[PDB]
Design a binder for these strands. Sequence first.
DNA 1: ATCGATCGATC
DNA 2: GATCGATCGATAAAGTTTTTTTT
Lengths: 130, 243, 663
Amino acid sequence: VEQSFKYTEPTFCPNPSCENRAFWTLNVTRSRFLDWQKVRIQENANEIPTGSMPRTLDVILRGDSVERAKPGDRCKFTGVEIVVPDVTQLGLPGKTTEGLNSGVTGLRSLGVRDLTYKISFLACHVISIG
Amino acid sequence: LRIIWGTNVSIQECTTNFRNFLMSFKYKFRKILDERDEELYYIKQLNEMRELGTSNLNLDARNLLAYKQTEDLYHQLLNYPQEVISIMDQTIKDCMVSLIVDNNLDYDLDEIETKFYKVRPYNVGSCKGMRELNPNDIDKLINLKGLVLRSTPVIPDMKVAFFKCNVCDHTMAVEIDRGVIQEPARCERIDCNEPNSMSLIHNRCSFADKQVIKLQETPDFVPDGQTPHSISLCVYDELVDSC
Amino acid sequence: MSAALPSIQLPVDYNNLFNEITDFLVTFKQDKGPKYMAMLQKVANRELNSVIIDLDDILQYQNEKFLQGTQADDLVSAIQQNANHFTELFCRAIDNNMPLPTKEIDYKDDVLDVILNQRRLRNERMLSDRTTELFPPNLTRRYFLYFKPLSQNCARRYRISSKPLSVRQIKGDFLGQLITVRGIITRVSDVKPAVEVIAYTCDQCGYEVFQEVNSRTFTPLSECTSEECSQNQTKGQLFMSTRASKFSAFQECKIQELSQQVPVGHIPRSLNIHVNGTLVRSLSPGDIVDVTGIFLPAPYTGFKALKAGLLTETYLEAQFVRQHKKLTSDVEERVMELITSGDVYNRLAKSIAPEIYGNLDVKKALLLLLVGGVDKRVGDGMKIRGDINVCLMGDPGVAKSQLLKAICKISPRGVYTTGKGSSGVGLTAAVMKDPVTDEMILEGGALVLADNGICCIDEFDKMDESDRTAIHEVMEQQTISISKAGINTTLNARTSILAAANPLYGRYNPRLSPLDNINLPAALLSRFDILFLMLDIPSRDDDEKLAEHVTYVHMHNKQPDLDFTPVEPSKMREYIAYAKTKRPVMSEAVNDYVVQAYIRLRQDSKREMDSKFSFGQATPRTLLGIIRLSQALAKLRLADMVDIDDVEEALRLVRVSKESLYQ
DNA sequence: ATCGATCGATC
DNA sequence: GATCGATCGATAAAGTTTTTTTT
């Protein structure tokens, strides 16, 4: 259970002494799903000091809260925070000195890389006053 | 006094040499700016730190040049500028406690004596831009005059780590304090816990703030042919999104 | 190995040259004994880090070795047969004759002083702390070497290495040699710290490991390699440290060609150059210079199979730069000549631009704008206008840019522009593409860099959709800004404008109305002050002199005419700066008389009220210009005589401003 | 061409 | 059963003048 932010390979504790971590087969039958979307937000008009490139961030809607967020309106959110990296996986090969903190983050137990950490945000419940 | 492989700095004489200079000041500098002051700004302000509970002391730091002693401390600030602020953050906690030992009714000696205050030596020396920054300037104070251009939001930083392997309950929290994260190659928390899948729960250990800003100098009497170049910034304390 | 690894029987070794470097101790007393050893004393006390081992101290070293009949091989051959093997054997020859403790430095008065001895003594004590690695020679240097070739009559004495070649013919055997090339320096990078030594710390044994630096990419080592913190069950984990390793300077530049040694065919060819030692921060974009330096190709070390089989993409390494063509401060003997002789109104008028036909009145109207004239140090919140802007019009066949912009090419801080290229959005600053280095820099045109100077423009009907607004925005006070999506910051605006709006089709018909070829009336009505004109009338007497004015210049190769003693432009350049240290203050007698001079200017414009010829409708915005230029002409003619006689020179110049169309 | 990972062999 | 050595496989590339409707 509990596939993490990159755990596309459940490879722990087989029943018999078979070849553990040898393969997998993502069954579309029993593994129940849920539906989501990824939208961007923006800061309200009555708080900007000047035209000073008003920054933003990104959210994730998880439950039934999909499609309740009509785009282009003043809106409120739940408030759980999160940080999500994704640089090393099975498929595709993974300016300034952005990600300079990442050099500290090296040398995990798997292969030596430069793993970053970017701030993001998760929601649970939406409301739209106005 | 102690001796470091890196520096040559002393033991806490200069802290005490500051603390008598700090407390027994009441006026100085009347001679370098000779015009003709009954009590120092900092003397009232050091009382003013506790009664608001803030953590910042904006030190002018051109007082050691006015004082007769503490020149050695003054000319070690501009030559090992990481340990000297790392020393003075300990002293200002104790020099605040040097006021709480007089009046024991000052915030119960516990809770404001947990959050670490800090200092800010500003407007020291002089500098003239970018076409003088030699490679010898490795660890010094610099005084830039320019213009910032554009900012990115805050990304986090590894100030504390966390670990948990696949046993029942084992929630150790290792530190980093370097550019190097250290791991165990065999488990713990039980006798029969062999080398196994030590996992990295990332979204549990706390992080501070950090922000990089890009700067380009103003054309301040540039010789009318040279393109104004750029340099970046970096910040750690509670100054993010205040500039 | 086999397969031709035994080389040829080369008769030229370096050991026969090595002992002929050991003789470079004290023997050359001519050039207060050994003078290169005398310069060796002025480096150890740490005030300059550049020695110069030239060739005149080698040929005269061989000139006085001509009489000794012994085998002395040639020296200027091998230092340009292969130049790069003549920095490293000098360094292993300097230290045997290097007097170290000739200075006296206790604690301060030297950068990195106590720690270099501390980093020496902690390895000096560990040379005998067993009851071991020697210093690499690049560690304790704090100095560099340089070179200098020759192209004097010493080369015409007897027997090249310093002929000023161009980059079109440097393709062949000139690799690993010493060649000076002239050119034009473009694309100046910044100064970045390069690495020459290293020191990793294990935090267990403290043996800082050293290594040499190869090309632009390298790799750290392991941690179980040292002599104390290795070889046990616990190993000191390595990590770096900045201050335990020196760092040098670095800057990159590209060269082009002189646009006259290029042949009739192909475009010019670029080249790469580097800098070392302390020649840095001594070049500029636009320097008509030449560099002398040694040659080296470098490998690419990327994508080596499917590209870059044996290619080179070389550069050259610099050794020496020989740059060329660069207020009572000991030139006052030529600045007093204006004060003794005087002759402000006409000799200075005939001084600047003496190559024109007539028009001595209009060359006076520009020179007071070359000294400007400050309006007022206002103090309070009254940012008043100064630095008036004079515009011209008219259609001659003389291509009048030589009549304006030749002044602009000798005037201080006077930049030139045209129609194409810098538009009105390209007049101010902007954010554009850049190379692979730091992009979105604030590139600009003129007015963000020509502040408090001269902005001489041509072709006023070119790129007008962005131009026509922005030229108002310097006359509109202090709004030169970049209001793009990037930022909303605003810089200053303090520059005068000289404009020559070319007319429309044919001659400007004087029987027709004006403002038929000028674009913006709003700039002309109050945002300008005075106008001139360049009409043509067929004249029998003047034009044959004008024919003699142009036919005479092809007999000789000069213009000796007009019986005037020509003056160097640096003289009045100082006198403008000398006038800039005056700033006279007006008296009260002036405004008692000019108040009704405006009234004398009032009813005559209110007499016409016609759409036939003239402009102006009696505004004080016309009046304040003649108040501005009055103290301006008082500035160049400082006797502090701000009176009626000074202001009659002002109305002298405004009566010829109007009615330039009445012929 | 270099580095990392996996497999096989030896202690 | 664990550790070390050898062999095999996978990893690094770059853009900005002609032509369409449209205002």
